[PDB]
C-alpha cells in the first residue's frame, strides 16, 4: 500500500519524462493545459496530482519547467541510491543490464545471477555473473534493495521467495505471472504486452467503430 | 488521434490480462466491485471505460468473464493477425523475439534484421537474422504490419524512415528518442523507466512524506 494512489504514482514518471525534454529544448515555462494536451490527462487532474507534494508555480503562470522537473526528480526518489541485482543472465537480463541510463537515476547494478555454470564469471559491463545459489548471502552482504527478475516463469516463485527471505525490499518483475510477495515488499510487474496491444488496438480502431458505435 | 482517449485505451490490456487469469481459473462472473478490488482501480472507472464499447455485465451479477474477455480481445484487435519484424538482433531484439506469447495473441514474427555480419544467418525460433539492407524489400514482399526497433539510438530515425517508406503501419519503439513518423503511422514508445521509477517512488515515499508533513 501507498500514501498516494497508484494511479497518480504512475503518471509521475510520465510528467518527469516530458519535463526533462522540455528542459532539453530550453522551454522555460509550462502550463497544466500544455501538459494536459501532451499527456492525455485533464489539466485539473494534473494540478491535483502535483498538489499532493506542494506548490510549484502559481496563479495563472504554469510551472517553472526546471523547478518542476527537479521537484519530480526528488518526488520519484531519484536523488537516492538503490542497489540492484538481476536474476537471469540470458538475452533479457543482459539487455536490462544494458539500460545504463538507470545508473544516473541512482540504480546501481551490483551483480547478475544465473543457474547455468557455463555463464559463471561472464562479465557484463561492470559486474560478474555469479551462481544464483549465492544470491541470498549476496543480498545481505551488499545491502541489495531491488531484485530484477529476467528468468523463465517456471521457477520464478521460488526465486522471489529466496529474494524475499534474504531481505529484498522490491522486485522488478518481467514475467507473465502474478508472483506472491508479502505486503511490505514492493512488487512491480512489467507487462510489455500492455504496450504492444495498444498498437493492435489502434490499427483496428477505425474498423472497430464501424462495427460497434 | 484516436476515437477513444489514450488513457482508456491503455487500461484495456490490463483488463484483458486479469479477465484472462479469471478465465483460466474458471471463474464465471465477477462484479465491478470484486474486479476493482482485484486490480486496485475504481469500480466506476472500469464501467466508464467499458461503456466506451458497450453494455457488458449487468445489475446484480456483474460481468460474465468469458464474454468480457472475448469482447476485450476483439476490442484490442487481437482477433486478427499482424506480421512483425524486429530490427536489432542484439540482446534486446533477441529477448523480444523470445516473447512467444505474442504469437498466440496473433503477432507473427517474420524476420529479424541487423547490420552485424557476424549475426547474419543466426536462427532465432523459426526465423533467420538478415542484413537490414534488405529490409525495405522484405517489408513489401511480406506485408509487414509492425516494425519493432531494438537498435541503438543514434540511427533509429534513419531506420524508422526506411520502415515508413516501405509501407510499415506501426513502429513499436524501444529507444528513448522521440521518433518522427507521419501522422498516419502508429508509434508506440516503450519506457521501462516509467515502471522502474514507481519502485524508487514507493521505496522512498515514507521519507518523502516525513520531509513534507
Ligand atoms: N509474453 C512472453 O512471452 C514473455 C513475458 C515475459 C518474459 N518472457 C521471456 O523473458 C524471460 C527470459 O528470457 P530470455 O530471452 O532472457 O531467455 P534466455 O536468453 O534463455 O535467458 C534465460 C536465462 O535464465 C537463466 N535461468 C533459467 N532459470 C533460472 C533460475 N531459476 N534462476 C536463475 N537463472 C535462471 C538461464 O540459465 C538463461 O541464462 C522468460 O520469461 C521468457 O519467456 C516472455
Ligand atoms: N534507459 C536506457 O538506458 C535504455 C532505453 C532503451 C534502450 N536501451 C538499450 O536498448 C537498445 C538495444 O540494446 P541491446 O542490449 O540489444 O544492445 P546490443 O546488444 O548492442 O544490440 C544492438 C544491435 O543492433 C544492431 N544495430 C545497430 N544499428 C543497427 C541498424 N541500423 N539496423 C539494424 N541493426 C542495428 C547492432 O549490430 C547490435 O546487434 C539500445 O538503445 C540500448 O541503449 C537503453
TrEMBL record, chains A, B:
Output this protein's name: Redox-sensing transcriptional repressor Rex
Regions recorded as binding DNA: 14-53
Keywords on record? Cytoplasm, DNA-binding, Metal-binding, NAD, Nucleotide-binding, Repressor, Transcription, Transcription regulation, Zinc
Main role?
Answer: Modulates transcription in response to changes in cellular NADH/NAD(+) redox state.
Residues the record lists as binding Zn(2+) 3: 178, 191
Q: Which residues bind Zn(2+) 1?
A: 21, 178
Entry similarity comment:
Belongs to the transcriptional regulatory Rex family.
